[PDB]
Design an enzyme around this catalytic site. Structure first.
Site, mmCIF file in Angstrom:
data_model
loop_
_atom_site.group_PDB
_atom_site.id
_atom_site.type_symbol
_atom_site.label_atom_id
_atom_site.label_comp_id
_atom_site.label_asym_id
_atom_site.label_seq_id
_atom_site.Cartn_x
_atom_site.Cartn_y
_atom_site.Cartn_z
ATOM 1 N N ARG A 214 9.675 -5.827 -0.691
ATOM 2 C CA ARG A 214 9.228 -4.802 -1.625
ATOM 3 C C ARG A 214 9.210 -3.439 -0.959
ATOM 4 O O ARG A 214 9.580 -2.451 -1.589
ATOM 5 C CB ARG A 214 7.838 -5.160 -2.215
ATOM 6 C CG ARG A 214 7.179 -3.980 -2.979
ATOM 7 C CD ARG A 214 7.958 -3.571 -4.258
ATOM 8 N NE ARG A 214 7.488 -2.305 -4.802
ATOM 9 C CZ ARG A 214 8.203 -1.522 -5.596
ATOM 10 N NH1 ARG A 214 9.446 -1.878 -5.960
ATOM 11 N NH2 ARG A 214 7.697 -0.365 -6.012
ATOM 12 N N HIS A 241 -3.366 -6.829 -10.205
ATOM 13 C CA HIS A 241 -2.148 -7.468 -10.703
ATOM 14 C C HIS A 241 -0.920 -6.989 -9.919
ATOM 15 O O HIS A 241 -0.904 -5.867 -9.420
ATOM 16 C CB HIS A 241 -2.010 -7.138 -12.197
ATOM 17 C CG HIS A 241 -0.864 -7.808 -12.883
ATOM 18 N ND1 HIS A 241 0.422 -7.318 -12.830
ATOM 19 C CD2 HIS A 241 -0.820 -8.898 -13.687
ATOM 20 C CE1 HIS A 241 1.221 -8.106 -13.534
ATOM 21 N NE2 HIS A 241 0.489 -9.064 -14.074
ATOM 22 N N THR A 339 4.777 -11.949 -11.554
ATOM 23 C CA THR A 339 3.883 -12.137 -10.406
ATOM 24 C C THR A 339 4.568 -13.024 -9.347
ATOM 25 O O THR A 339 4.513 -12.740 -8.143
ATOM 26 C CB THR A 339 2.567 -12.781 -10.901
ATOM 27 O OG1 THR A 339 1.881 -11.824 -11.723
ATOM 28 C CG2 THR A 339 1.588 -12.982 -9.727
ATOM 29 N N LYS A 439 10.034 -19.344 -34.659
ATOM 30 C CA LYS A 439 11.032 -20.308 -35.139
ATOM 31 C C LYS A 439 11.020 -20.364 -36.664
ATOM 32 O O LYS A 439 10.432 -21.264 -37.281
ATOM 33 C CB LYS A 439 10.806 -21.676 -34.496
ATOM 34 C CG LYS A 439 10.782 -21.661 -32.955
ATOM 35 C CD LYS A 439 10.374 -23.020 -32.412
ATOM 36 N N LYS A 525 1.017 -7.419 -22.413
ATOM 37 C CA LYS A 525 1.717 -8.502 -23.103
ATOM 38 C C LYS A 525 0.876 -8.989 -24.269
ATOM 39 O O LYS A 525 -0.347 -9.164 -24.136
ATOM 40 C CB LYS A 525 2.043 -9.650 -22.152
ATOM 41 C CG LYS A 525 2.983 -9.242 -21.020
ATOM 42 C CD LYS A 525 3.574 -10.452 -20.296
ATOM 43 C CE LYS A 525 2.571 -11.141 -19.379
ATOM 44 N NZ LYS A 525 1.932 -10.208 -18.396
HETATM 45 N N1 LIG Z 1 10.037 -4.413 -18.045
HETATM 46 C C1 LIG Z 1 9.637 -5.489 -18.720
HETATM 47 N N2 LIG Z 1 10.139 -5.680 -19.998
HETATM 48 C C2 LIG Z 1 9.792 -6.785 -20.752
HETATM 49 N N3 LIG Z 1 8.909 -7.692 -20.251
HETATM 50 C C3 LIG Z 1 8.409 -7.515 -19.002
HETATM 51 C C4 LIG Z 1 8.748 -6.417 -18.207
HETATM 52 N N4 LIG Z 1 8.089 -6.550 -17.025
HETATM 53 C C5 LIG Z 1 7.350 -7.681 -17.083
HETATM 54 N N5 LIG Z 1 7.547 -8.290 -18.301
HETATM 55 C C6 LIG Z 1 6.940 -9.546 -18.801
HETATM 56 O O1 LIG Z 1 5.845 -9.896 -17.975
HETATM 57 C C7 LIG Z 1 6.028 -11.193 -17.440
HETATM 58 C C8 LIG Z 1 5.375 -11.325 -16.076
HETATM 59 O O2 LIG Z 1 3.989 -11.191 -16.310
HETATM 60 P P1 LIG Z 1 2.956 -11.586 -15.149
HETATM 61 O O3 LIG Z 1 2.944 -13.129 -15.149
HETATM 62 O O4 LIG Z 1 1.541 -11.098 -15.540
HETATM 63 O O5 LIG Z 1 3.439 -11.147 -13.838
HETATM 64 C C9 LIG Z 1 7.535 -11.391 -17.427
HETATM 65 O O6 LIG Z 1 7.862 -12.772 -17.390
HETATM 66 C C10 LIG Z 1 7.925 -10.704 -18.720
HETATM 67 O O7 LIG Z 1 7.694 -11.535 -19.840
HETATM 68 O O1 LIG Z 2 4.618 -8.665 -14.638
HETATM 69 C C1 LIG Z 2 4.909 -7.994 -13.654
HETATM 70 C C2 LIG Z 2 4.575 -8.458 -12.265
HETATM 71 S S1 LIG Z 2 5.168 -7.165 -11.149
HETATM 72 C C3 LIG Z 2 5.706 -6.308 -12.433
HETATM 73 C C4 LIG Z 2 6.356 -4.984 -12.207
HETATM 74 N N1 LIG Z 2 6.500 -4.333 -11.043
HETATM 75 C C5 LIG Z 2 7.075 -3.132 -11.155
HETATM 76 C C6 LIG Z 2 7.410 -2.155 -10.226
HETATM 77 C C7 LIG Z 2 8.014 -0.973 -10.649
HETATM 78 C C8 LIG Z 2 8.298 -0.759 -11.998
HETATM 79 O O2 LIG Z 2 8.896 0.420 -12.355
HETATM 80 C C9 LIG Z 2 7.975 -1.728 -12.966
HETATM 81 C C10 LIG Z 2 7.376 -2.932 -12.588
HETATM 82 S S2 LIG Z 2 6.939 -4.172 -13.589
HETATM 83 N N2 LIG Z 2 5.521 -6.816 -13.660
#
Ligand SMILES: Nc1ncnc2c1ncn2[C@@H]1O[C@H](COP(=O)(O)O)[C@@H](O)[C@H]1O
Ligand SMILES: O=C1CSC(c2nc3ccc(O)cc3s2)=N1
Length: 539
Positions: A214, A241, A339, A439, A525
């Site tokens: 990263r 997060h 994540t 669906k 979300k």
């Molecule tokens: N730029 C993005 N556009 C659409 N969905 C996103 C984006 N970034 C993250 N997500 C959604 O967030 C999920 C990850 O959420 P999290 O488990 O909280 O890390 C991904 O599997 C996507 O469904």
């Molecule tokens: O759900 C997640 C877990 S980490 C992440 C992101 N990390 C980022 C870093 C830069 C950015 O422009 C946008 C995003 S979205 N979104």
């Protein structure tokens, strides 16, 4: 397989040393410049890089003197505050894993989460303290609670400064502290929790190798932001997060002033952009509405703002384009990740905007899109499940080998659970979550496509879409809508508006309910389960 998309070589190769070693190297450089690391937007309190580094080094030594060993565990339970990253950085410095959580977790979520990560010490905000005390009644292995955001002992608990004082020799020289080198690919650095999960939180183990990857992205001239002295970035994303964690740590590598904003009223937001001369802002999709509708932009000097970025959830193409236009920017910078992939693995490259795109595969990563049934790779302009592979893939869930196996296949590909596609030029587009698709007969309707139509209506402030069970059609698309203050629409008005903009399959046959707040998770979300419950209620 020509269907696999491969990211380019990073401009800056991954550096030697742990994530702690790299943070210390860069923080030390910016400390000697007299640069500011963190600023609380609303109070104006600053922490210099010097102060932040010193406290992190001192806490590192304190944790060792307390008796924590390599691969021990600590946690945070705090809303965003300028002190948040002190225990994170201390843990990275000494090889003690850090489990971040937010004060906003429910007690069921927090008891589950800390029950998995098993922290010896919890660094709690004042606000989070009661929840931490309650959780400790179940997770009885939590030995110590330290108050993160107080300069004095609080309700009988040691504050951060007291903990440090009580666990370091008088006159201890922070400058003498050494970062601990670790087995980079194996050593757990962080235990993270996703947001918006349909189940209880799982503990996602991220390693030093994940983090130093990263760090290469963050400084990348195409896939990140270039180092530039004391430049200010406005951040609104939750620190506990991955989205807030890895943008913020990347900003510290870059030497930026991290302007942390926790209040989202329009006047504070714009005053913050102006007063701290912010060059970049990192947002969740909800806040784009504020900027698109604001009648006040003209009252502020927003001339320093040259980048608007989004992540975490689907952003309406048209809303993003409108906001970019208002600010006379080419487009909104986007990042997409999970994540379980540490940070964003698809990012808009500098000088390579494409309308609607989430971006391109980051350096050192590969991505593919697979057929939902056969699991075989697909060519461009074909929707399927996005899969990724690369050195930011998590080590695995804590004590959950079954869940790890379900997510990462026998060939090492992580199945994201997201529908998307890539175009001929390899720009990726993320549509929605597979589990969210509605669906309706033989159709698979993405709620984000309908949400985007709703968010374009000038009388609608917010919206979320989910499926209503139906004996004949399986599921019917339905919506919950928050109306703009002073504006009204009937259910019929909303339905007819949507029907005018979408295919027959996508009509809101499941109806429209009006509410004060759309149920969403911590990074934007949509909470489908909650929306379905609202839609089910006789109204
Ligand atoms: N730029 C993005 N556009 C659409 N969905 C996103 C984006 N970034 C993250 N997500 C959604 O967030 C999920 C990850 O959420 P999290 O488990 O909280 O890390 C991904 O599997 C996507 O469904
Ligand atoms: O759900 C997640 C877990 S980490 C992440 C992101 N990390 C980022 C870093 C830069 C950015 O422009 C946008 C995003 S979205 N979104």
């Amino acid at each position: 397989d020509e269907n696999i998309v491969v990211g380019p070589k990073p401009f800056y190769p991954i550096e030697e040393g742990s994530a702690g070693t790299q943070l210390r190297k860069y923080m030390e450089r910016y400390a000697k410049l007299g640069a500011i690391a963190f600023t609380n937007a609303v109070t104006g309190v600053d922490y210099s890089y010097a102060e932040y580094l010193e406290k992190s080094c001192c806490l590192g030594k304190a944790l060792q003197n307390y008796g924590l060993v390599v691969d021990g565990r600590i946690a945070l339970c705090s809303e965003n505050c300028e002190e948040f990253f002190i225990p994170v950085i201390a843990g990275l410095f000494i090889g003690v894993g850090v489990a971040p959580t937010n004060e906003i977790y429910t007690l069921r979520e927090l008891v589950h989460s800390l029950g998995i990560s098993k922290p010896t010490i919890v660094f709690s905000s004042k606000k989070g303290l009661d929840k931490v005390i309650t959780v400790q009644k179940t997770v009885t292995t939590i030995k110590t609670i330290v108050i993160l955001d107080s300069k004095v002992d609080y309700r009988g608990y040691q504050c951060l400064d007291t903990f440090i004082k009580r666990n370091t020799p008088p006159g201890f020289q922070a400058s003498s502290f050494k970062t601990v080198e670790v087995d980079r690919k194996e050593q757990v650095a962080l235990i993270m929790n996703s947001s918006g999960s349909t189940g209880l939180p799982k503990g996602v183990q991220l390693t030093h190798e994940n983090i130093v990857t990263r760090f290469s992205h963050a400084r990348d001239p195409i896939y990140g932001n270039q180092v530039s002295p004391g430049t200010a970035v406005l951040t609104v994303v939750p620190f506990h997060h991955g989205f807030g964690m890895f943008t913020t740590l990347g900003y510290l590598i870059c030497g930026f002033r991290v302007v942390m904003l926790t209040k989202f009223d329009e006047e504070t937001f714009l005053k913050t952009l102006q007063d701290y001369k912010c060059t970049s802002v990192i947002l969740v999709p909800t806040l784009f509405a504020i900027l698109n509708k604001s009648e006040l932009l003209n009252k502020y000097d927003l001339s320093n703002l040259v980048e608007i970025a989004s992540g975490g959830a689907p952003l309406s193409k048209e809303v993003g384009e409108a906001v970019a236009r208002r600010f006379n920017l080419p487009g909104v910078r986007q990042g997409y990740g999970l994540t379980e992939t540490t940070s964003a693995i698809i990012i808009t490259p500098e000088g390579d905007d494409k309308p609607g795109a989430s971006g391109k595969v980051v350096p050192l990563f590969k991505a593919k899109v697979i057929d939902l049934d056969t699991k075989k790779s697909l060519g461009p302009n074909r929707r399927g499940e996005v899969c990724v592979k690369g050195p930011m893939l998590m080590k695995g869930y804590v004590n959950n080998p079954e869940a790890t196996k379900e997510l990462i296949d026998e060939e090492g590909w992580l199945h994201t659970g997201d529908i998307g596609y890539y175009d001929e030029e390899k720009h990726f587009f993320i549509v929605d979550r597979l589990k969210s698709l509605i669906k309706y007969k033989g159709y698979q309707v993405p709620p984000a496509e309908l949400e985007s139509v709703l968010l374009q209506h000038p009388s609608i402030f917010d919206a979320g879409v989910a499926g209503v069970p139906d004996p004949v059609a399986g599921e019917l698309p339905g919506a919950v809508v928050v109306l703009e203050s002073g504006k009204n629409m009937t259910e019929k008005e909303v339905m007819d508006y949507v029907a005018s903009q979408v295919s027959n399959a996508k009509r809101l046959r499941g109806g429209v309910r009006f509410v004060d707040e759309v149920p969403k998770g911590l990074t934007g979300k949509i909470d489908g389960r909650a929306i379905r419950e609202i839609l089910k209620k006789p109204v």
